Write a protein that binds this ligand. Sequence first.
Ligand SMILES: Cc1cc2nc3c(=O)[nH]c(=O)nc-3n(C[C@H](O)[C@H](O)[C@H](O)COP(=O)(O)OP(=O)(O)OC[C@H]3O[C@@H](n4cnc5c(N)ncnc54)[C@H](O)[C@@H]3O)c2cc1C
Ligand SMILES: [Zn+2]
Ligand SMILES: [Zn+2]
Length: 741
Amino acid sequence: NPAHAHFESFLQAQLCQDVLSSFQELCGALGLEPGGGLPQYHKIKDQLNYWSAKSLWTKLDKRAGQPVYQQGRACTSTKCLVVGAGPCGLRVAVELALLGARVVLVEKRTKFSRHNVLHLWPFTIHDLRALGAKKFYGRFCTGTLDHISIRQLQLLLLKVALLLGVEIHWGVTFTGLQPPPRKGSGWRAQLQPNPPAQLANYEFDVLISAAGGKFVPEGFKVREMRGKLAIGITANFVNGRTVEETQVPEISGVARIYNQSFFQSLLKATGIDLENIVYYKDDTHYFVMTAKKQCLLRLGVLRQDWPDTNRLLGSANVVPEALQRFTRAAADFATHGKLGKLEFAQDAHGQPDVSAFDFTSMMRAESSARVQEKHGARLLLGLVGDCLVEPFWPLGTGVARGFLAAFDAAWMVKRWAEGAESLEVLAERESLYQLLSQTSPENMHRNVAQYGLDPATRYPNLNLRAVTPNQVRDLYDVLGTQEELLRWCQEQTAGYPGVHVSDLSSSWADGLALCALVYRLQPGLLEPSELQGLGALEATAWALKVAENELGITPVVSAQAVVAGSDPLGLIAYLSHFHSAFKSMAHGDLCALCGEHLYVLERLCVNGHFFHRSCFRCHTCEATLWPGGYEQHPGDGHFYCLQHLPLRRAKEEEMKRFCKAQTIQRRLNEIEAALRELEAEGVKLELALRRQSSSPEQQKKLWVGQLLQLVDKKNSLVAEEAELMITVQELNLEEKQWQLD
Ligand SMILES: Cc1cc2nc3c(=O)[nH]c(=O)nc-3n(C[C@H](O)[C@H](O)[C@H](O)COP(=O)(O)OP(=O)(O)OC[C@H]3O[C@@H](n4cnc5c(N)ncnc54)[C@H](O)[C@@H]3O)c2cc1C
Ligand SMILES: [Zn+2]
Ligand SMILES: [Zn+2]
């Protein structure tokens, strides 16, 4: 059989174009009518008598015999379409095909020319070799290697899927869904430029999308997650597979808190600042980095200081030659020269493999499902992979998250196909989406040899009813705090002579109100006899000091403006501190380092002195100085920090500590972005709130209302990152003990 001859040409291919040629040859021939559908598989093991293939069939049988498989009669009438052929899209197509639906895939690209590396969770490893992954790549999961290139996995899963009768039209660009003409008709899809007829009229009632990060489908809004600007570089080197490079240890990567010693060493060697570097020794060596803009400008890698991240990535703007030099230097300095000679990776384009990319902003989807019904037709929309959850690249969570999304989509579509209505399925999928953001090898089951599609075996104790049906009516489509703060103040005033509370401000400048407040904050702090023995300036200084000593709450107002009383908003915030402190348990005005008045959104006191928040940085390393790691020089008043003052479980815990450190750093970047945005908003609002301090009483109450809302939000957050920072010093601490070990 010439058809069977091209079958071994197929199953023995190593390049994508060869797979395409074999498929096209079978398309021209009429030997077996390739890819006609699922039943092909049930006849395909018949006319094959090579012993070496047994395991393949065996494994697929052991994968096609689960009761959850319904023996293939699950959703037979149903008909589907997958846009996107990454690992996630291939998993969606193949798994949805297994249960029996008609499956077609489309791709604008036609050649497997992505040569970078991907990281896989253990469940991804087991589920990936469940499809007989041994056959298509010899070195798969060989020992401790747990990292597979994009094209390798792409080819493996594509060959597996093509053994299971999936239909593909390459060179096809998705651009929308054609509305039904009339009653009883389903949804067609717009594809370009000119797909063949057999798909052009192929009509479907299910669509699961894996378009990736750059494309999201109709009917979904997008949210942006942003941080401080950071650019990254991806580099590759064609490996000679030599022993000298093979014996090289694989540094798991470097993060700012994670290897401060490594940054110090690389600065001493060559004075180069990075933010993150990770090194992968697969077939072609992978180097992923992110770093600091002015260190990157130091070598001139950029010519013009363009704020726009994508346009900063502009090739005309980017100095490529400097990029190659910097990549080479970063590599050979990171690996400590035992690589010896290095040669650039020859890409598909015809050049070295280097590129400049983004590590800051990520798209996100609030909703992972949409059932749209028209002309008596129920249509389902779901997202799998990066289109739903676009991750931080190097965390390596993309493939695992996409495969979890694939299982979610398969389960939910098979549930809806059985006549189940919209409410329960959308509720279930939103219930799993609420947990998807915290997927982790940690919160997964400890042993992995019994997984599948059933959501009960993947999320222990899943409250599937997390979202009531009535919440998704939108997802179905057919055609003055000052009053309450004051009231709390009176509640803290019961039985006090000489304390005549009338507003938020005038009743506190007396001074004894501070003592009464701290009294009922915690009983036994002071004897009642001495209550009438303090002076007003002394009383307010004492109250501030005791509040910092007992609760450690941040002062907002100094004693001079207290007795002056002309800036009540600070005292409002200061009382608001305790207003939020008991919400459950009890139910020189300028700056020199910033040359500006401490405008309240950035006004802060530095151990009994008055400077801005932004100006508080180390002159050497221009970082934020948190308690336990800095100490002020009294000679000049400048602010300086400390150094700146002139076996399987082993690798498992190493990876876990890397991931947790990086997560901490990313969280700090997120908080910094949030603080900058909120302080800009507060600046623009307080412009009026100070200038236009004569609004209507309702307007004045509203302004101060969100002023309090915002300041209380900062209080809660700064507490949260205070505890996170404390986690940082303690993690450095047992790093010191581990070095001591
Ligand atoms: C250049 C690059 C480098 C990357 N490097 C890394 C890395 O080092 N580490 C890492 O963990 N992750 C990396 N990723 C992301 C990686 O894709 C995911 O993190 C993970 O591999 C999940 O892969 P995926 O299935 O999301 O691929 P996808 O993003 O789903 O692949 C995009 C797919 O959508 C298809 N598509 C898009 N538009 C259309 C259309 N109109 N019609 C038909 N098909 C369409 C594309 O052709 C392609 O098949 C990288 C991504 C890119 C683009
Ligand atoms: Zn200052
Ligand atoms: Zn410093």
